[PDB]
Write a protein that binds this ligand. Structure first.
Ligand SMILES: C[C@@H](O)C(=O)SCCNC(=O)CCNC(=O)[C@H](O)C(C)(C)COP(=O)(O)OP(=O)(O)OC[C@H]1O[C@@H](n2cnc3c(N)ncnc32)[C@H](O)[C@@H]1OP(=O)(O)O
Ligand SMILES: C[C@@H](O)C(=O)SCCNC(=O)CCNC(=O)[C@H](O)C(C)(C)COP(=O)(O)OP(=O)(O)OC[C@H]1O[C@@H](n2cnc3c(N)ncnc32)[C@H](O)[C@@H]1OP(=O)(O)O
Ligand SMILES: C[C@@H](O)C(=O)SCCNC(=O)CCNC(=O)[C@H](O)C(C)(C)COP(=O)(O)OP(=O)(O)OC[C@H]1O[C@@H](n2cnc3c(N)ncnc32)[C@H](O)[C@@H]1OP(=O)(O)O
Ligand SMILES: CC1=C(CCOP(=O)(O)OP(=O)(O)O)SC(O)N1Cc1cnc(C)nc1N
Ligand SMILES: CC1=C(CCOP(=O)(O)OP(=O)(O)O)SC(O)N1Cc1cnc(C)nc1N
Ligand SMILES: CC1=C(CCOP(=O)(O)OP(=O)(O)O)SC(O)N1Cc1cnc(C)nc1N
Ligand SMILES: Nc1ncnc2c1ncn2[C@@H]1O[C@H](COP(=O)(O)OP(=O)(O)O)[C@@H](O)[C@H]1O
Ligand SMILES: Nc1ncnc2c1ncn2[C@@H]1O[C@H](COP(=O)(O)OP(=O)(O)O)[C@@H](O)[C@H]1O
Ligand SMILES: Nc1ncnc2c1ncn2[C@@H]1O[C@H](COP(=O)(O)OP(=O)(O)O)[C@@H](O)[C@H]1O
Ligand SMILES: [Cl-]
Ligand SMILES: [Cl-]
Ligand SMILES: [Mg+2]
Ligand SMILES: [Mg+2]
Ligand SMILES: [Mg+2]
Lengths: 558, 557, 558
């Protein structure tokens, strides 16, 4: 009818939803995760018309988590789309997690019409006010002709400097409001984030300090992965022959099988190093604040970070390298060519690191070899690690499940491990997996979660099936939070869940493949069948209720 | 060993977790929904030792929704317990919903140790700052000896006046910090919320206005359900013979089968009334702001609300009745004893209401009787409504599923319907159902959700199974958000999985699962699900294009 | 007497007030402006014991403005000390002004005792929450032993990166609480803010663009004055021969009498430039957003700013130079030597600039020479400018008084003009003057305020007299806000004040010298006497009610 090409069409006007979609596409947004509804249905449809991939989720929580993981994987702010009111409130989880991890993110939240403000409109809410404490940038788009301006400013703010979350509030009457095409002020395309360099004397001072250290340690954080500095870091470590330690999501910047990794002697390396070189890593709880009882009280610090305000937190920095990871390590490699220095091939430090790695390997070897059922964590990961392709993207989530999987699942390329992060968040699991499968559909995506962690976002398995994402979900079920629990007229323990739950049947609700494992003899065949199945799958593994990690001198939290 | 009763034990000291547990119990907290972890594990354990019922959920979203539902059902603030950092941020969902619905709740969020503030500690976060815009009350507990003070003040703030959410921040070193039991200052027990009355002239002016109206309408909102005013409201309606309209969760304050209800002629009643008596209901979007095009421009308003600031919002109130719903309607009943007036037995207003009711009944009658498969919404509810016990607690969630279920599922007692509420929230479904099953285990609990709504909180079925809650989950699956979609070109943003076998989720956790696609299967499946001694899911594949009855006005406008 | 040295004393403990004083002194805080009272009296007393200069003001509003001006003048965060409750709320003015100008400052606010929280204590308030939106950093000090930690972190957060305000909340029980001196954990001394450099290809790209421009313009902002980049900028301008425009408080980075200044042809220079080089200046309202109708639609931008997120705001930047102004201009000077280029001595661009300067000079020449009484603004500034020493510190505040004074009072060294700034704030006048008199007591401090501006902070004249600060306050009184008003059965107009007010008698209330000027013949002798008076002085000049600035093609705001 009105879709006949023979009829006269106005064709001069454009509405806010369309301008938003074009601006997002211009600014490099390729993925949009969310849940539609009033008033954002036109936004999702217009985004699809511009070629943006829209992924409809089952909860805004996972959608806001998927958005920032896709941002991390692409190096580019990607979008989360939620409805007014509780849509935005649900998505506050992702804003908080993206702020704490320094990951970019664009949350687009619908709002009730401006003309109804004050009246008690449907899902009326002070949305910019609620989001502001968790965002680098948060603003309401008051008029549709200003959409290109706001999308450019929001993307730029989220991407430049220390990355973080941006929020755009889209009222209903702005989404549907129309303006003349020829009257809309265009906006420039946001390019690559600016890279800054360190002063030359800071470069030379860092090398001076490295040459003088008896027990140096390089710590590779996920700031280097975000900076895409892996080439420069690998050259720097190879030329200096310096021992290095990867952070949880810094794994892969250096290959985990590199002979200079101290990952198997982590506590001794932190305890005994006289100099620590922080590469895109913070002295927060992940690295135990750089302070006793985990470090020498007199540890010297070279700190490379883009955030000037981060320099010297908790432990003073002897040499500060403020700027971009890739750029500054490039400076170090250039300055190394004039020094002709490397850490000597034989030092007591190297011998102590090697002895500790072998001691820790012998401590967990019987647990890895133990075929008895119900299985311990290390036995389970023996079969899992042996079936992980070298280009896989690993999502890990839980307490023991995640921590033990971190040391038992090596990464050989950067940006290939996504876990609970600097916020210790449960609920990122399947959202991260959906984002990884959307961004890199040619690579296998394996999520290894505990039974508690799986419950936070397990409904998103339907999302993966609906979009043909062959995500492999492996659940390590001990029947509780961190540990199992003997079944109780006493009430159930607060940490207890269901040890006999058949989570794999959730995969069969949505056309995926489900596998249940209780004996070690079943694990191999089940994992083989799950990996070969052309589609998403769940392997539910009932592990020992009392299985625990390797004993250590220090508690992880302390 | 150290627990041998022969061993000398020092018993003088108590820590913050135990103080928190004793204070919550003293203040009437019987239910605590949450997810444990650093640092709140001692709090949940201590709560159970005091006899508090701890319910471990699967997401803090549902835990915060369950807490406010339990508060609405019990009449006292109930607790939601979450870990530091993302635990609180996940729980902000429930604070906002409780704020908007004027429902109390107490959120107890753990926090990182005070002595590590600034260091980038595990899950360090400005938690009070984040929660403050969503709460009536939000404060950190800085020392464990002040826990009785803060619990009393938080519960009192949540419960008294216009109810709302309260937040208490519990740092790790306060939870584990010890004090001498004899040195802790006790706190008074928070009693019932104060009830206030209206001036006598306002009472008389309200009754004078009722006598003068040609087309009066009483609107009964959930503020009367919160106020426990059902006895007084029923006496008021039976005395005055006035037509009434229930709001969505005001259903049941008056029985939905009462002959004075105008529910089946709702649009006509709002449009043509010359006087509206608001009982604990707002002129917000749920009542279309009391303005055109849904009301007469000159509609006269009697407004009963506890909140003085709410009086006259959008539409001016000719008579204001600021105070408690139960006390004020009691005043009206007492003042009516001196008047011979009642709304007459036969008026053109009654005839117009009755005719419009019959017209809407005949408009939906063919759909209710249509046994065509895949079924429409009204046909599905024909079998559901015939099997709902009259004392059931009904949870409704979705768009078409919820709105059509609102008209097809009558409630005969108050506080027995829990739905998306004033915030239009998807995600409250199984959290509300778990709350209802915990508070009223002797009553049946039936949640009717759309397929989209179920996806928000479906994992909480494991919670119901783990606690032996025989919740009956009925899913109306059209394969999308509000309506279905043809199979795919990428999938439509609103599309879900029409062929999904959601009922197998019940079988993951020991419940009964039922799949219905034909009308002949619906009856036997509902029979078996209601009779099964445990939780159950009935997954009904409905027509992808089934819709609600056509109306003159869109619900939103 | 308990003060006799013969008596045994404890000496082993220290309270929070003393730890705060020692930490502030260690971190380079030399000046503390505030008003004492519960609970901060011990803090100011302890600060004086460590040698910190305490300045007791008459309103926290001016104290908070003084602290940030002293921070700008010293290059390090200086302190404002206020009481609980309304003391902090009064001081929010300074936090907002410091945020908008990117100036550092440390606000120290007392709080009611922690043990009384919730009870309705005296001046109990959510002080961190109120201050947080206006601060880079805001935190409460919960225990006295962590004071060194928080002071270090607050000073560093205010000073590093883009500077801004930091707030520390000091409860009464923390101020008076005692700890063992040997158990207090020390904190490192905050050094100079880190400097970052631009990548070399960006440096060369900037020089390439400069060589290609037909009508280039360098804009020198107060970011270069903060960065102490004046010598690098002066070398760059001398070697490139580029015309330059100074921003309001950028005046002095280049001397105002420099022949390359386009200040006398500002509108034409911005309108016609084909390339603009922003040096530590933003495209905000002060530079008219870098957009039409004040700029060419195709103007090319080289942008030097420390804040990566600011790059490309309103007008896209062709070359981004993210880093420190001093460091990056140093790179440009070094890279300039590799080439053989300067902007030619004879171009149509230079002729157009010189013609507009001469035209604008001839437009105001009659007003400057007009001895008519009541005097116009330009006539008043003829006598003021002739008596301003070349090393003076000038404070300007008002509308016409400030804007006309900006062009009539040249500065020849940087950081010597303090005015309403990027926030357009009235109320900074005597607070800025007191700060300048405290930081540079060996230099003359002259504040030229309109009559409305003086009323905001005029009581601080007592502060100047109490501390022996010979501040010279010159008031231009037209009897209203922006303009005069005829005498009023009619109420006074909202902008009207008192044209016949004798503000100079305020000086005689506090021991200063007051001078009243109505005729041009009195102006010179009055200024001579005020400048020679060995103390603070007020010269109250009753100017014409309808005196105005020279007409322009565009309104300053637009
Ligand atoms: S609940 C709340 C949820 N919680 C979270 O969200 C926090 C997540 N938690 C973390 O982020 C980490 O927990 C930290 C904080 C970074 C600490 O780190 P971490 O102490 O856990 O260290 P990591 O996990 O790397 O290794 C553990 C031990 O295994 C040794 N090890 C490593 N690799 C091998 C190998 N291949 N073979 C044999 N042994 C190995 C290693 O050497 C060390 O033993 P050690 O050296 O201490 O004796
Ligand atoms: C789609 C997706 O992207 C979304 O973003 S959605 C967002 C989620 N959405 C919500 O959160 C909205 C919740 N929505 C509401 O809260 C209600 O919608 C209101 C706002 C209160 C309006 O109310 P309401 O207009 O819907 O009225 P009600 O539901 O009571 O009844 C309907 C018609 O059935 C007639 N009727 C009643 N009873 C019987 C009977 N027994 N037999 C025959 N007919 C009957 C009655 O008379 C009327 O017909 P009428 O009188 O107008 O001709
Ligand atoms: C409503 C009222 O109550 C208020 O609420 S107020 C609020 C308080 N308000 C503020 O907070 C804003 C302060 N305002 C500014 O920040 C400036 O306003 C800008 C925004 C930077 C624009 O700048 P500007 O347009 O004012 O230009 P500038 O002041 O530099 O010079 C003026 C004209 O004099 C020419 N000129 C310069 N030097 C000489 C000389 N030596 N001889 C002869 N002529 C000269 C120059 O060329 C130009 O003339 P043009 O080129 O346009 O023809
Ligand atoms: C529940 C929970 C965990 C599960 C461990 O149990 P799971 O079965 O997943 O793994 P297990 O250790 O192999 O048994 S960790 C944790 O910190 N936490 C608290 C926690 C709760 N909520 C949020 C949002 N973030 C959290 N961080
Ligand atoms: C998804 C969604 C709905 C489901 C309708 O689809 P469902 O299958 O549940 O029911 P149907 O109508 O029978 O098909 S309603 C709605 O407002 N909304 C948007 C919505 C999204 N997120 C949140 C927190 N609140 C919302 N309100
Ligand atoms: C009153 C006022 C001004 C005085 C001009 O009158 P004044 O006698 O000082 O100078 P005149 O122009 O020579 O007469 S400017 C201005 O923006 N403003 C509004 C103004 C008010 N309050 C604050 C905090 N900031 C402001 N910016
Ligand atoms: N391009 C970049 N170059 C260098 N550092 C960066 C860059 N982007 C972000 N960073 C910094 O990297 C740090 C990441 O630290 P963190 O998340 O604690 O690492 P990890 O958790 O791996 O130890 C942040 O402090 C952030 O400021
Ligand atoms: N005890 C009480 N007595 C009277 N009114 C109350 C009481 N408690 C709450 N209210 C009011 O009841 C109203 C509920 O309105 P609303 O949630 O819009 O109801 P509905 O959704 O049923 O229309 C709120 O405005 C609240 O102030
Ligand atoms: N050390 C520094 N080097 C370079 N730029 C800086 C430095 N410190 C601050 N800046 C920048 O200087 C800019 C000041 O701009 P603005 O206050 O608008 O100047 P003006 O008002 O003089 O135009 C801010 O954007 C700030 O980020
Ligand atoms: Cl019961
Ligand atoms: Cl000096
Ligand atoms: Mg577990
Ligand atoms: Mg549906
Ligand atoms: Mg004036």
């Amino acid at each position: 009818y009105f879709q006949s090409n023979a009829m006269a069409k106005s064709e001069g006007k454009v509405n806010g939803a369309t301008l938003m979609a074009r601006a997002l596409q211009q600014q490099g947004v390729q993925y949009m995760f969310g849940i539609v509804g009033f008033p954002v249905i036109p936004i999702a449809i217009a985004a699809q018309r511009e070629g943006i991939t829209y992924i409809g989720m089952r909860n805004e929580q996972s959608a806001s988590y998927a958005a920032q993981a896709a941002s991390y994987l692409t190096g580019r702010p990607q979008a989360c789309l939620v409805v007014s009111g509780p849509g935005v409130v649900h998505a506050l989880a992702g804003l908080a997690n993206a702020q704490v991890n320094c990951w970019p993110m664009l949350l687009i939240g619908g709002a009730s019409a401006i003309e109804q403000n004050g009246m008690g409109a449907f899902q009326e809410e002070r949305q910019v006010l609620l989001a502001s404490p968790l965002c680098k940038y948060a603003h309401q788009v008051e008029r549709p002709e200003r959409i290109p301006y706001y999308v450019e400013q929001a993307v730029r703010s989220a991407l430049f400097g220390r990355p973080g979350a941006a929020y755009l509030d889209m009222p209903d009457d702005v989404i549907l409001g129309e303006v003349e095409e020829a009257a809309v002020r265009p906006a420039a395309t946001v390019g690559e984030p600016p890279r800054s360099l360190a002063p030359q004397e800071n470069i030379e001072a860092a090398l001076d300090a490295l040459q003088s250290a008896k027990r140096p340690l390089v710590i590779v954080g996920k700031g280097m992965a975000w900076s895409r500095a892996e080439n420069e870091v690998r050259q720097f470590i190879e030329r200096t022959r310096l021992p290095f330690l990867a952070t949880p999501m810094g794994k892969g910047v250096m290959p985990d099988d590199h002979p200079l990794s101290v990952g198997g002697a982590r506590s001794h390396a932190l305890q005994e190093a006289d100099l620590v070189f922080l590469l895109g890593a913070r002295f927060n709880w992940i690295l135990h604040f750089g302070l006793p009882p985990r470090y020498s009280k007199d540890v010297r610090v070279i700190q490379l970070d883009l955030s000037a305000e981060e320099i010297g937190n908790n432990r003073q920095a002897e040499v500060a390298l403020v700027g971009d990871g890739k750029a500054i390590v490039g400076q170090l490699n250039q300055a190394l060519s004039s020094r002709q220095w490397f850490y000597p091939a034989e030092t007591p430090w190297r011998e102590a690191i090697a002895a500790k790695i072998a001691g820790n390997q012998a401590a967990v070897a019987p647990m890895i070899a133990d075929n008895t059922s119900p299985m311990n964590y290390y036995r389970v990961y023996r079969d899992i690690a042996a079936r992980l392709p070298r280009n896989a993207i690993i999502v890990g989530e839980g307490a023991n499940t995640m921590d033990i999987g971190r040391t038992q699942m090596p990464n050989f390329e950067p940006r290939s491990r996504l876990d609970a992060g600097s916020y210790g968040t449960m609920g990122i699991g399947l959202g991260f997996a959906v984002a990884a499968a959307a961004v890199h559909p040619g690579r296998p995506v394996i999520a290894v979660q505990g039974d508690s962690a799986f419950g936070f976002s397990g409904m998103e398995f339907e999302t993966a099936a609906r979009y043909g994402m062959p995500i492999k979900v492996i659940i390590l079920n001990n029947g509780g939070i961190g540990m199992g629990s003997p079944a109780p007229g006493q009430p159930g323990m607060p940490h207890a869940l269901s040890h006999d739950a058949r989570y794999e049947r959730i995969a069969e609700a949505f056309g995926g493949a489900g596998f249940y494992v209780t004996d070690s003899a079943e694990l191999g065949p089940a994992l083989d069948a799950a990996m070969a199945f052309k589609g998403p799958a769940i392997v539910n593994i009932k592990i020992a209720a009392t299985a625990d990690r390797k004993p250590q001198q220090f508690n992880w939290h302390g």
